[PDB]
Structures are given as structure tokens and as C-alpha cells.
Design a protein around this ligand. Structure first.
Ligand code: A1AUZ
Length: 354
């Protein structure tokens, strides 16, 4: 570990725990292509089990970047098209409000203001059909951006239907395995239970709860080494041997919509690098934003700040990287603390190694 990286990581990271009371953090940094791992604290304060590089954290929203890439994959394979209407992959959806609503709307949170969360009373396929059949859009499609789980959750449920495989099974055979992410799981098995860290909310130990469309939007738990390999894949997609997966990544970093100084992609968010720090810091705080369509979707711009946040009841996660300098940083922790603290911390560390 070079002294510069080590120093700045510690002098930036240690106060964050001290101020945010975070039980355990894993922090990986990618510099000139080489990863570096750092840990702090305890994975299980009750069983005095620490946080290691094989300790699993619930990624939460950062699962949506996985769900994006897995769709772009099927775009490359020709099984699904980003322009088709929703009803072509779901004929039983006989509601007239869905007319005009493509899969780009489903993916980039521009479907007309679909709810941010899937209701807890929705458990069976029939309940899910009625939920989306009775929903009525706030706005026209393609006009306003409302971040939502249920919009992206359905995109990833429908993006694998022609291929005949479950979403877990597609994910594993088409992204997880080929990239040698062997410790990232949708459903944690008993064998890895020991690596599973408990989240702490309000002092109480908590894990992610089963839900409708939960794998598709916030069901992906992973380890700090697999996040490092995943960032390394997203830095430079040309080294992936599989041509559909490379294209799937490259599509995921494509700018489909623009709102303020941010761009919407397939699970990721892009910013023209260099960026004003304070602007994006207030942009990462927790609403209805309207978007100016980019015709046509821009291809992946190397000199971009590509980032995404992930939050769960008991965990917080942040991933950011800049292709142009071959730099990146990921933070994962078993307490959901404010996102602008993550972002401030990423910005200082990355600016120092820049
Ligand atoms: C800004 C951001 O970026 N990525 C994120 O996850 C967030 S967040 O603040 O909005 N997290 C969040 C907020 C409210 C509800 C849920 C939820 N819905 N079904 S389960 C769970 Cl938990 C998740």
C-alpha cells in the first residue's frame, strides 16, 4: 500500500466512523488498476466478529447497477429491446395508461411517477399484476424523473423473461460467474452465513426483509473484493472476454436523460468530470425532477464521474469511479449514515489520488 493512498484513506475515513458511530466499514480503492483493501470495526458486535475482506454487506440500491448491466446484456443478445412497450413482455397488463411506456421509461425512472416502493401487501404474482394494473401515472411518460424501486424492479423482472430463466439464474450465469464474482449472492447460503454481517439500525440488529421484486432492486449482497472487481470491470469494459457483457456495461454508462448537471443511465449516474463537489454533495441528499431527453443516448464518456448509492435499513453503500484516470473507490458499512458524508469522503480521497 503506497503511503499516499494509505494516509489519505485513514485521515479521511477514521473521522467518518468517529462522527457517524459506524460499527464496521470495508473500503476498497482502485488506483492505476490495482485494488487496495481497508477495514475497520466489527461485523457482529455481539459475536465480536470483525469486518474482513470476506465480510458480506447488503448492497441495497447498488444492486440496481447490477440489474442495469444484466439488461444491457440482453440488449446485446437481442432478446429484449429498450424501445418495446411494457405490454410486449407482459400481455396480461390490460391497462390503457401503459401505452407509450417503453423499457427505457421502466429503467430510467421516467415512467410517469411510479411509486418509490412496491407495497408490502403485494406478495403473489396476482397482487403484482393488480398493483401495476390499477396504478395511474402522475405525469406523461418521458417527462419527469422519479427514482423508484418498482420501476427498475419490473425492468429487471421483464428483461429476463424471453430467456426463460429466473432473474437469479440469469444474473449468476451471465454477470456474476463470468466476472469471477464468486462471493456475491442474491440469496446467502448457510455456507456463507458466517460471512454475513448484521446491520445495526437504532442499535438493533437487522437484516434485509423479503419483499416483492426485492432481488431486482435491493436484493444483492456482496463482499469488498467483489465490489473491487466489479469497479475494475466498469472502469474499462474492453477486457471482458464476453462480448454481450462488455456491451451491457458500456450501455449501462450511456447517458439517456439529463436533469440539472446529472445524467441518467441504466442503474448508474454520470457527471461530466471534473465536477463541483458541493453541487453533487447536495445532489446526493434525499424528489420529482424533470428531464431533458438526450436524442440520441450518448455513448459511455470516459472522462465522467460514474457513481451510485445504496441504502438499506441497516447498511450503507457508495461506489464511484473515474474512467479517465483509472481511479475508483467503494465504501460499505453496516449502518445507514447520510449519503453526502459518503460523497464528501469519496471526493477528497479521489481528488487526492487524482
Ligand atoms: C437516494 C438513494 O439512493 N439509493 C437509495 O437506496 C436511496 S434511499 O434513501 O431512498 N433508500 C430508501 C428510502 C426509502 C425506502 C427504501 C426502501 N423501499 N423498499 S425497501 C427499502 Cl429499504 C429505500
Amino acid at each position: 500500500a503506497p503511503q499516499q493512498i494509505n494516509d489519505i484513506v485513514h485521515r479521511t475515513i477514521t473521522p467518518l466512523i468517529e462522527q457517524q458511530k459506524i460499527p464496521g466499514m470495508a473500503v476498497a480503492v482502485i488506483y492505476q488498476g490495482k485494488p487496495y483493501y481497508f477495514t475497520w470495526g466489527y461485523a457482529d458486535i455481539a459475536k465480536k466478529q470483525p469486518v474482513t475482506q470476506q465480510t458480506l454487506f447488503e448492497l441495497g440500491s447498488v444492486s440496481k447497477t447490477f440489474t442495469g448491466v444484466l439488461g444491457g446484456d440482453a440488449i446485446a443478445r437481442g432478446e429484449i429491446k429498450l424501445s418495446d412497450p411494457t405490454t410486449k413482455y407482459w400481455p396480461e397488463l390490460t391497462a390503457k395508461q401503459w401505452n407509450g411506456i417503453t423499457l427505457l421509461h421502466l429503467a430510467t425512472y421516467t415512467a410517469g411517477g411510479l411509486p418509490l416502493q412496491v407495497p408490502d401487501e403485494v406478495k403473489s404474482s396476482s397482487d403484482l399484476l393488480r398493483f401495476y394494473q390499477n396504478w395511474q401515472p402522475a405525469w406523461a411518460p418521458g417527462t419527469q424523473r422519479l427514482y423508484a424501486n418498482s420501476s427498475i424492479g419490473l425492468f429487471g423482472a421483464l428483461a429476463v423473461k424471453p430467456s426463460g430463466l429466473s432473474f437469479e439464474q440469469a444474473m449468476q450465469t451471465r454477470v456474476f460467474q463470468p466476472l469471477k464474482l464468486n462471493h456475491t449472492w442474491i440469496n446467502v447460503p448457510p455456507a456463507e452465513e458466517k460471512n454475513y454481517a448484521w446491520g445495526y439500525r437504532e442499535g438493533k440488529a437487522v437484516h434485509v426483509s423479503p419483499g416483492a421484486l426485492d432481488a431486482e432492486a435491493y436484493g444483492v449482497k456482496s463482499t469488498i473484493e467483489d465490489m473491487a472487481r466489479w469497479v475494475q470491470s466498469n472502469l474499462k469494459p474492453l477486457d471482458i472476454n464476453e462480448k454481450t457483457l462488455q456491451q451491457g456495461i458500456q450501455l449501462a454508462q450511456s447517458r439517456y436523460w439529463q436533469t440539472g448537471d446529472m445524467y441518467q443511465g441504466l442503474g448508474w449516474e454520470m457527471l461530466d468530470w471534473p465536477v463541483n463537489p458541493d453541487s453533487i454533495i447536495n445532489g446526493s441528499d434525499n424528489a420529482a425532477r424533470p428531464v431533458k431527453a438526450i436524442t440520441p443516448p450518448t455513448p459511455a464518456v470516459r472522462a465522467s464521474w460514474v457513481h451510485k448509492t445504496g441504502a438499506t435499513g441497516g447498511f450503507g453503500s457508495y461506489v464511484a469511479f473515474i474512467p479517465e484516470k483509472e481511479l475508483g473507490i467503494v465504501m460499505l458499512a453496516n449502518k445507514n449514515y447520510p449519503n453526502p458524508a459518503r460523497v464528501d469522503a469519496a471526493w477528497q480521497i479521489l481528488n487526492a489520488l487524482q
